[PDB]
Structure 1
Amino acid sequence: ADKELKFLVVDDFSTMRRIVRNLLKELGFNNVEEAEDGVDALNKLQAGGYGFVISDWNMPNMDGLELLKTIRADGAMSALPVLMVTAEAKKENIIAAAQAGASGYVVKPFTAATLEEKLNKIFEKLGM
């Protein structure tokens, strides 16, 4: 994928956003922004330029399922890649996010190798 692709990393805890940001840099992506919840996330997406979202699930104000649903229902954002990265691992939640349109789903804790695998799997399916 184009190394200039802009990412938005959403999680309500700094530690996790920091881990994803660093991993993304390893992969060659330095155009990355952070958000602390769904609303904050939507405000930045509004601002424009984003080509990929990586989101947590449990966050105050607007959780990740809602954020995902919001993005898919928005005419100007509906196809935006959204990779869930969460501790939620019950099948019913994986199903709910999958059905809601999630591009991929990663359960915490995750290895560096797993994140790169899932990001590439999504680039592959979208021809990015």
Structure 2
Amino acid sequence: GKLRVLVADDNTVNIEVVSRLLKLESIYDVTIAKDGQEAYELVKNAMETGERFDVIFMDIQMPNLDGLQSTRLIRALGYNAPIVALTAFSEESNVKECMESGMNEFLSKPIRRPALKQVLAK
């Protein structure tokens, strides 16, 4: 009934926009990661405490550990739920390395309610 969502981005502007769009979609249990190392730690903790994140939103470029590497580590942990890339496309096949890293779906900034909803439906 209630979704538990993780949003990982280093940019607070994008965080607040995504958080609003999620709140509009009646999703309140939203945890924030500022980089990919935090994201890994939060998923690890979530599996350790038995609280599964139902979806993760993962920015590609972040300090300490980027989104591609964080995702690979997350899959390595055995987290098997969807991961959605938050991207600022400078290329088209950037998705291939993303999918190779373990990401499932793709949102390009600017992120809006129509596209987020389509992702959540599936």
- TM-score interval w.r.t. the shorter chain? 0.7 to 0.9
Aligned to 2:84: 83
The sequence identity of aligned pairs, in percent, is: 29
**Paired residue type of 2:15:** R
Matches within 5 A, 1:40-51: 40-48=38-46, 49=51, 50-51=53-54
Q: 4+ residue stretches of structure 1 with deviation over 2 A?
A: none
Cα distance between partner residues in 2 of 1:33 and 1:18:
12
Cα distance between partner residues in 1 of 2:100 and 2:33:
24
Aligned to 1:52: 55
The count of aligned residue pairs is: 117
C-alpha contact (below 8 Å) 2:44/2:77 kept by paired residues: no
Aligned to 2:31: 33
**Paired residue type of 2:60:** W
Matches within 5 A, 1:1-128: 2=1, 4-48=2-46, 49=51, 50-75=53-78, 77=79, 79-120=80-121, 124=122
Cα distance between partner residues in 1 of 2:42 and 2:100:
25
Structure 1 unmatched ranges of 5 or more = none
**Paired residue type of 1:57:** I
Aligned-residue Cα RMSD (Å) equals 1.4
TM-score by length of 1: 0.84
Between stretches 94-103 and 13-22, larger displacement belongs to 94-103
Q: Report deviation, 1:17.
A: 0.9
TM-score by length of 2: 0.87
